[PDB]
Design a binder for these strands. Structure first.
Ligand SMILES: [K+]
Ligand SMILES: [K+]
Ligand SMILES: [K+]
Ligand SMILES: [K+]
Ligand SMILES: [K+]
Ligand SMILES: [K+]
Ligand SMILES: [K+]
Ligand SMILES: [K+]
Ligand SMILES: [K+]
Ligand SMILES: [K+]
Ligand SMILES: [K+]
Ligand SMILES: [K+]
Ligand SMILES: [K+]
Ligand SMILES: [K+]
Ligand SMILES: [K+]
Ligand SMILES: [K+]
Ligand SMILES: [K+]
Ligand SMILES: [K+]
Ligand SMILES: [K+]
Ligand SMILES: [K+]
Ligand SMILES: [K+]
Ligand SMILES: [K+]
Ligand SMILES: [K+]
Ligand SMILES: [K+]
Ligand SMILES: [Mg+2]
Ligand SMILES: [Mg+2]
Ligand SMILES: [Mg+2]
Ligand SMILES: [Mg+2]
Ligand SMILES: [Mg+2]
Ligand SMILES: [Mg+2]
Ligand SMILES: [Mg+2]
Ligand SMILES: [Mg+2]
Ligand SMILES: [Mg+2]
Ligand SMILES: [Mg+2]
Ligand SMILES: [Mg+2]
Ligand SMILES: [Mg+2]
Ligand SMILES: [Mg+2]
Ligand SMILES: [Mg+2]
Ligand SMILES: [Mg+2]
Ligand SMILES: [Mg+2]
Ligand SMILES: [Mg+2]
Ligand SMILES: [Mg+2]
Ligand SMILES: [Mg+2]
Ligand SMILES: [Mg+2]
Ligand SMILES: [Mg+2]
Ligand SMILES: [Mg+2]
Ligand SMILES: [Mg+2]
Ligand SMILES: [Mg+2]
Ligand SMILES: [Mg+2]
Ligand SMILES: [Mg+2]
Ligand SMILES: [Mg+2]
Ligand SMILES: [Mg+2]
Ligand SMILES: [Mg+2]
Ligand SMILES: [Mg+2]
Ligand SMILES: [Mg+2]
Ligand SMILES: [Mg+2]
Ligand SMILES: [Mg+2]
Ligand SMILES: [Mg+2]
Ligand SMILES: [Mg+2]
Ligand SMILES: [Mg+2]
Ligand SMILES: [Mg+2]
Ligand SMILES: [Mg+2]
Ligand SMILES: [Mg+2]
Ligand SMILES: [Mg+2]
Ligand SMILES: [Mg+2]
Ligand SMILES: [Mg+2]
Ligand SMILES: [Mg+2]
Ligand SMILES: [Mg+2]
Ligand SMILES: [Mg+2]
Ligand SMILES: [Mg+2]
Ligand SMILES: [Mg+2]
Ligand SMILES: [Mg+2]
Ligand SMILES: [Mg+2]
Ligand SMILES: [Mg+2]
Ligand SMILES: [Mg+2]
Ligand SMILES: [Mg+2]
Ligand SMILES: [Mg+2]
Ligand SMILES: [Mg+2]
Ligand SMILES: [Mg+2]
Ligand SMILES: [Mg+2]
Ligand SMILES: [Mg+2]
Ligand SMILES: [Mg+2]
Ligand SMILES: [Mg+2]
Ligand SMILES: [Mg+2]
Ligand SMILES: [Mg+2]
Ligand SMILES: [Mg+2]
Ligand SMILES: [Mg+2]
Ligand SMILES: [Mg+2]
Ligand SMILES: [Mg+2]
Ligand SMILES: [Mg+2]
Ligand SMILES: [Mg+2]
Ligand SMILES: [Mg+2]
Ligand SMILES: [Mg+2]
Ligand SMILES: [Mg+2]
Ligand SMILES: [Mg+2]
Ligand SMILES: [Mg+2]
Ligand SMILES: [Mg+2]
Ligand SMILES: [Mg+2]
Ligand SMILES: [Mg+2]
Ligand SMILES: [Mg+2]
Ligand SMILES: [Mg+2]
Ligand SMILES: [Mg+2]
Ligand SMILES: [Mg+2]
Ligand SMILES: [Mg+2]
Ligand SMILES: [Mg+2]
Ligand SMILES: [Mg+2]
Ligand SMILES: [Mg+2]
Ligand SMILES: [Zn+2]
Lengths: 103, 163, 99, 186, 46
RNA sequence: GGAUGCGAUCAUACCAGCACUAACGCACCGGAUCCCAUCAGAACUCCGAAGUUAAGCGUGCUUGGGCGAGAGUAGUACUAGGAUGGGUGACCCCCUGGGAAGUCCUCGUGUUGCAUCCCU
RNA sequence: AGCUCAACGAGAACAGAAAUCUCGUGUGGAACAGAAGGGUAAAAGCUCGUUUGAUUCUGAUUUCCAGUACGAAUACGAACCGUGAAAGCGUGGCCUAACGAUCCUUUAGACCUUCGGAAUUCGAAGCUAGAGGUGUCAGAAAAGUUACCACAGGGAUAACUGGCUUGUGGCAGCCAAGCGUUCAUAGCGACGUUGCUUUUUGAUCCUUCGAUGUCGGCUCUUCCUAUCAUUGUGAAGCAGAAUUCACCAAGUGUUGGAUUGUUCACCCACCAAUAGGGAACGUGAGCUGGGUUUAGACCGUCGUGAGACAGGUUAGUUUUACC
RNA sequence: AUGACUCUCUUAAGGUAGCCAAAUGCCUCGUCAUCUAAUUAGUGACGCGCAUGAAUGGAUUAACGAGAUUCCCACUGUCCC
RNA sequence: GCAAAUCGUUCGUCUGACUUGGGUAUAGGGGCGAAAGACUAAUCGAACCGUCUAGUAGCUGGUUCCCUCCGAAGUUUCCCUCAGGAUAGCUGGAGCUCGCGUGCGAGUUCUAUCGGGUAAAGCCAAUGAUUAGAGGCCUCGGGGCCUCGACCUAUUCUCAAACUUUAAAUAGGUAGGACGGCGCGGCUGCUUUGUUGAGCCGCGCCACGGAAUCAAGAGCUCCAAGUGGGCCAUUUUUGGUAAGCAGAACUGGCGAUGCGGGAUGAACCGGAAGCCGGGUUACGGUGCCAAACUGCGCGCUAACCUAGAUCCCA
RNA sequence: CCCGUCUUGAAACACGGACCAAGGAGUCUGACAUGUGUGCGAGUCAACGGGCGAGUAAACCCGUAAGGCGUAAGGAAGCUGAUUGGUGGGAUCCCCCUGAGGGGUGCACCGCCGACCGACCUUGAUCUUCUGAGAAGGGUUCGAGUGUGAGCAUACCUGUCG
């Protein structure tokens, strides 16, 4: 150790060379996932390729409460207000989340 | 520290002069010190407070601060390849007003008037001093000449007062 | 070394901020608590196998300690600490020289 | 033998040409090699030297700082061997003639909107071959992170040099040596 | 153990370097009472 | 020309012995109620003005000691640089430069600021 | 604030060299905690009065020095005090040494901050300043032995030869007090003083630790002279005989044995004589292996012990030439 | 000359019976005797024994030993050579 | 080597704690041991095999093309630090800011001024050490009025790294203008009895550069290598009889460097260097070796000891 | 005089080297740093992934409150959060004058001294929900701050570390 440099903290004291994850298959993974989506679209035709309808939910914590995003599924209270029985909703492309509350 | 105390090797440097001990004359305390004045550091052995390190004894510096009982002095100190401007405070008992620049102020005035007198007459001159140059030729009146010759050697005289 | 029982010194309390009478007593280190975080960590580190997990000083060299005077202000009833130089014999309120 | 140092040769190094391979910069260098030689203008000599300099020796000049230095000098042409950036902190942009190696997209739009003109150094030679009525400006050279780490070491007295630390917080160089309660403060 | 041999030669390779002298010197370490009044004098200077 | 008060320089101003001094001073000097002070009114302190220039202070003197200055010691001792200088060595000459100190000898024995007062 | 010390001189019942008291001289010849140096006399010393600046808050500077820390010291600023009539002095000791990081613990201080769902009270955790210590003193927590030994290296470093040196060892000269019955010098040379030698032992650590085989004897050659015998001579306190001193001189010779591993030594005997040395302390691919100096084993002393012993003892592989 | 005896310091106890310059003694090639022409060897004695000693066994001991040592006779190329 | 333990002769024991085959049991910090740390497959004071493993090494060895330019250090501080590391110094690269003689720089001197306690000197000055007489012989002791020594006065021989009144040479510090000076005003909470000071500010005016010499220029910053074993010499100098010994001071030199001279030699003398021609020299030389006189002059020496023959130097 | 090597010192009686061919040693990667080249610039970065596409491991396109770094610091924390420059030198340019000249201009950089934000300390008219607000006025204290941004991505050498 010599000169004025930041104090090194390299975490390379284990057998790290046995746990290196390369990404040479990254182009192949893109190809495989695209093929899976293309195959899935034909299976569910004419159902939309985007999948089930997801609800609008707020971001968590003070840092993200100003934005909205897709949630898991519509709450039971929301489905009842919309007049859609919960057992029928998943069969017509509506995601159902029995855990979500409505505050 | 590290093998030498603050006043090590000061047996002679910090001792008072012969038959010049005891009360310090009060002209020392009546001196006026201003910023920019030059002072010579001379440690007085009787005053143990505000005394400079032995290195600064016998050095001349420039006054950069004035306090109730001491003056701040700037002293050059050579450390390896650099000169450091050491700023130290010293009680006025250890400092004497230096006469290193006594000729400067009077010289400037003489140069200014000489140039002023020459300017009015349109004669360009130089007020620079010059070192001693070669002497001109001259005649010396003849006088009685005393002849100097080598002295014959005598062993008995090879001792102060002779043998 | 002999120190007087009472001493008139400066008081830092905002009430006084002045010289007041103080009572002189010797400071004594308190008992080590088992709940102190450092003690809690040490006991955890010492548990199980591995033996002594921390250094144990052995090479004692000092023959004295820096005695600390505990000065309790009589006005504000607050305490201040004043260490003194090393000494082997120390007392508070001992008979003064000559008397 | 001769009592000299390094055989009387210079041991100083200065840039006699740009390090860049930019073909346009080399054309500008050729243009201002001719101007400096055939005119003896001090302005041309300074411009030629600054064209050789590295990126950090050609710092950008903010538009706001350009406006302040150009106040009361509308007639003069501002010359900068470097890049002119836009400054959102400046609201009123007066019409000004500015010559620079490069203008950012926002800076060019603001200057052109205000009736000003953005010039290159080849256009400047046509309008001011000797640099007549020019305002020569330089950006802040020492306003960058690296310079904060230069000078006396952080641990020496009377030092405000920024140390090299991988993170900022109570656990990163705040202990012994940075306060009296831990050994000393430095 | 110790010797000063060659040390003066090393010092004179690039030295002796005198410190750069500026017209105005730092006021740090001067009498605070004098400095504080000087700051007030400049504040009301006109 | 001096004294006195405060001084500056801190022996050319000190030390010893001897001699001398107008005027105003400065002293010695009288006393112990009060302030103050001790074993002790010796000192310190307070009050005073009979006596005396005896001392102190001042000045002068000494083939005096010391101190100060000069001369001399001496271009000696020592010393910077130089030599394919001498010499077995120890040491030393020469070349380009710098350069002391006791003894002995002669001379000197303060100078001076501010204020007040005497000579007036 | 007042006072002046060491010492000496001259005086006073018991009282003297030395008790106490008086006068005089007294540049410090005393004293100032300790080492030494410096410093100090209406004081820094001595005796009394009043006291706690040995206080609180930062920063700056010096010494150390990387111009880092610590210790120590200095000059100011802003407070609160002491002392004196007052100026003034006081931030420990007249000055130059007398001391200590991180983590942890403990104490002091701030109607202070946090315990992260919101509160209260305990508890705990922080902020600021000290204390408990690292003397290897910039600060690991630390007993031996190895002759059963291992590895990395080191000729940066010991144990041979050689080299420098020659104190020591050995050999030699000069001066002449004296010895020699008489008589300094036939033969001697006290007190001093000048040298030589590397056949003693030390001093050093320059060469060799990816090795120059480490005692002595045996065998064998050559060399030196500071000559033991032999040849030729000078001197004598040389009658003869024998002996002694000195000169040219290294041609020839200098032995057989007891005891000891020895070198060294000592004795017996012979002889013209039984002189002294060098050659890597000549000589181990020449020998020998008694000794020393691996591993087995015994004794004595030492050590709790493993083991140790320039102490004794007994047994212990000596390789290769044809370049 | 020596020290039965006495005095004195002192230990848990002060080495007793024996034995010894011993495979244990520094000084040391100890002293005396013996063996030899001559012995730092051997043997027998002596003992204030650096530092001997009683199952850490002491002192002896017939017989035995590819154990260490000295001498004498025989024998011899070990040697004179 | 027949042999990684054999061969020859010579030796121990030989009815017993005897010798030996096969079977079988004990396996690595374990076994087994009539005990040698012996033996456990030529391996034993902890077997063998694979793996962890390319174990770590401040230590040894090696570390691959060419020219060109610059060019060191063996010193500081800290470190269980002394064969190491970090740190500063020395060095390279990268530049940047300026400058062209009006330079504000200098391992130099001059002028003015300041500090010093070594060399020498001093004792006939303090302190310490030390030799001898002389006078006075008052007063003390000594012995036998005498008498020696103590005492006093004036002299005298010889001395000091840890004594000194005095006191060099060499070396050390500071200063010699434009960052100067003067005049008139202003500011202040600091300072004064006091617009008295102190410092600063504004305006106006003056300032031939204010000693010599040189200036192949000056300043500033960044990143980083190597080094942190030194050695030699003149002189000063400590320990040591001394040392090609050990340890310091100033400078140079070697190391990193050839070249000429010293026969030969890291350091002595000369002198430092691109590849060449000519000229001339330094030190050293001119009888031969061997380039240049047996050159021109004076004297001394005669060696029957190997006469003598060139700084360091033998 | 034999090369290489350690060394104050090697032709060495210091070590390696009988000879030849071929093989044979500062690399790759992560982090950071200075320097330089390039792009853009108060921003910058297509990086996970998606849309596609040389019938295609490339190239091309996509950042909608994504994220990283930067754009604001100080404090242990509760918290608070930059009133926005003066001066001495100085490049360039302009005018007068033709001097080592005088005015105007004053970037970069350096020196010096204020102000502003924050920790600490200090201060408090006037208000308030009693603990807050803040008229004025501060400090030899402390900060890797402010006073009209300079960063981000990327390439490579060198250096420290794993
Ligand atoms: K993969
Ligand atoms: K010492
Ligand atoms: K444990
Ligand atoms: K007093
Ligand atoms: K008296
Ligand atoms: K240590
Ligand atoms: K000798
Ligand atoms: K060896
Ligand atoms: K042989
Ligand atoms: K045997
Ligand atoms: K046997
Ligand atoms: K048999
Ligand atoms: K094992
Ligand atoms: K090492
Ligand atoms: K003298
Ligand atoms: K004397
Ligand atoms: K280093
Ligand atoms: K090597
Ligand atoms: K070697
Ligand atoms: K070799
Ligand atoms: K770096
Ligand atoms: K962003
Ligand atoms: K996107
Ligand atoms: K805080
Ligand atoms: Mg690993
Ligand atoms: Mg989601
Ligand atoms: Mg230290
Ligand atoms: Mg030192
Ligand atoms: Mg547990
Ligand atoms: Mg347990
Ligand atoms: Mg040349
Ligand atoms: Mg060069
Ligand atoms: Mg702590
Ligand atoms: Mg500091
Ligand atoms: Mg009276
Ligand atoms: Mg009278
Ligand atoms: Mg006289
Ligand atoms: Mg003393
Ligand atoms: Mg102090
Ligand atoms: Mg009072
Ligand atoms: Mg103190
Ligand atoms: Mg005292
Ligand atoms: Mg003090
Ligand atoms: Mg502590
Ligand atoms: Mg704590
Ligand atoms: Mg919680
Ligand atoms: Mg240490
Ligand atoms: Mg062990
Ligand atoms: Mg050696
Ligand atoms: Mg001798
Ligand atoms: Mg003799
Ligand atoms: Mg060898
Ligand atoms: Mg061999
Ligand atoms: Mg051999
Ligand atoms: Mg002879
Ligand atoms: Mg006869
Ligand atoms: Mg012979
Ligand atoms: Mg020999
Ligand atoms: Mg031999
Ligand atoms: Mg041989
Ligand atoms: Mg052999
Ligand atoms: Mg042999
Ligand atoms: Mg043997
Ligand atoms: Mg053995
Ligand atoms: Mg025992
Ligand atoms: Mg044996
Ligand atoms: Mg017995
Ligand atoms: Mg015995
Ligand atoms: Mg015998
Ligand atoms: Mg026999
Ligand atoms: Mg016997
Ligand atoms: Mg016993
Ligand atoms: Mg028993
Ligand atoms: Mg026994
Ligand atoms: Mg027996
Ligand atoms: Mg028997
Ligand atoms: Mg048997
Ligand atoms: Mg056969
Ligand atoms: Mg088992
Ligand atoms: Mg068996
Ligand atoms: Mg064994
Ligand atoms: Mg294996
Ligand atoms: Mg490897
Ligand atoms: Mg340590
Ligand atoms: Mg090495
Ligand atoms: Mg470095
Ligand atoms: Mg002088
Ligand atoms: Mg001295
Ligand atoms: Mg002296
Ligand atoms: Mg002398
Ligand atoms: Mg090394
Ligand atoms: Mg060293
Ligand atoms: Mg050596
Ligand atoms: Mg080297
Ligand atoms: Mg020669
Ligand atoms: Mg030529
Ligand atoms: Mg001739
Ligand atoms: Mg060597
Ligand atoms: Mg070599
Ligand atoms: Mg050799
Ligand atoms: Mg080797
Ligand atoms: Mg070989
Ligand atoms: Mg190859
Ligand atoms: Mg970059
Ligand atoms: Mg975002
Ligand atoms: Mg706050
Ligand atoms: Mg503030
Ligand atoms: Zn109080």
């Amino acid at each position: 150790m010599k000169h004025n440099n930041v104090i090194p903290n390299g975490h390379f004291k284990k057998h790290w060379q046995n746990y290196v994850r390369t990404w040479f298959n990254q182009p192949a993974r893109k190809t495989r996932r695209r093929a899976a989506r293309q195959k899935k679209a034909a299976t569910i035709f004419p159902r939309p390729t985007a999948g089930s309808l997801r609800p609008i939910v707020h971001g968590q914590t003070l840092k993200y409460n100003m934005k909205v995003r897709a949630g898991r599924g519509f709450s039971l209270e929301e489905l009842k207000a919309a007049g859609i029985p919960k057992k029928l909703a998943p069969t017509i492309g509506i995601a159902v989340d029995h855990r979500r509350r409505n505050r | 520290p590290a093998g030498h105390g603050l006043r090590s090797r000061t047996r002679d440097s910090f001792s008072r002069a012969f038959r010049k001990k005891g009360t310090i004359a009060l002209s020392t305390y009546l001196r006026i010190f201003k910023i920019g004045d030059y002072v010579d550091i001379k440690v007085n052995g009787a005053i143990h407070k505000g005394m400079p390190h032995k290195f600064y004894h016998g050095r001349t510096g420039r006054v950069w601060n004035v306090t109730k009982r001491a003056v701040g002095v700037e002293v050059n100190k050579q450390v390896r390849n650099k000169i450091l401007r050491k700023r130290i405070h010293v009680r006025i008992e250890h400092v004497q007003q230096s006469r290193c620049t006594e000729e400067v102020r009077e010289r400037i005035k003489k140069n200014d008037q000489l140039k002023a007198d020459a300017k009015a007459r349109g004669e360009v001159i130089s007020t620079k001093r010059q070192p001693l140059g070669p002497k001109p030729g001259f005649m010396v009146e003849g006088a009685t000449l005393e002849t100097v010759t080598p002295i014959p050697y005598d062993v008995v005289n090879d001792l102060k007062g002779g043998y | 070394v002999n120190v007087p029982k009472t001493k008139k010194t400066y008081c830092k309390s905002k009430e006084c901020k002045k010289h007041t009478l103080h009572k002189v007593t010797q400071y004594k280190k308190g008992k080590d608590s088992l709940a102190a975080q450092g003690k809690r960590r040490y006991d955890r580190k010492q548990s199980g196998y591995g033996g002594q997990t921390k250094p144990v000083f052995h090479k004692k060299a000092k023959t004295t300690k820096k005695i600390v005077l505990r000065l309790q202000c009589q006005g504000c009833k607050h305490v201040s600490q004043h260490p003194i130089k090393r000494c082997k014999h120390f007392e508070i309120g001992g008979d003064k020289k000559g008397k | 033998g001769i009592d000299l140092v390094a055989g009387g040769k210079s041991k100083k190094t200065k840039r006699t040409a740009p390090k860049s391979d930019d073909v346009y910069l080399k054309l500008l260098v050729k243009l201002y090699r001719f101007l400096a030689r055939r005119t003896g203008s001090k302005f041309n000599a300074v411009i030629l030297k600054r064209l050789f300099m590295s990126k950090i020796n050609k710092p950008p000049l903010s538009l706001s700082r350009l406006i302040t230095y150009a106040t009361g000098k509308g007639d003069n042409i501002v010359v900068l061997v470097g890049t002119v950036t836009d400054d959102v902190r400046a609201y009123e942009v007066p019409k000004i003639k500015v010559c620079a190696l490069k203008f950012t997209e926002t800076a060019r739009a603001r200057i052109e909107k205000a009736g000003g003109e953005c010039l290159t150094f080849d256009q400047l030679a046509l309008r001011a071959p000797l640099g007549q009525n020019t305002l020569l400006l330089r950006g802040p050279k020492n306003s960058r992170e690296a310079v904060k780490h230069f000078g006396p070491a952080p641990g020496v007295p009377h030092s405000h040099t920024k140390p090299y630390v991988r993170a900022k917080g109570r656990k990163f160089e705040r202990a012994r040596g940075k306060r009296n309660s831990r050994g000393y403060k430095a | 153990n110790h010797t000063a041999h060659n040390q003066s030669y090393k010092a004179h390779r690039n030295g002796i370097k005198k410190p750069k002298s500026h017209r105005h010197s730092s006021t740090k370490g001067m009498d605070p009472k004098f400095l504080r009044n000087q700051r007030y004098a400049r504040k009301h200077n006109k």
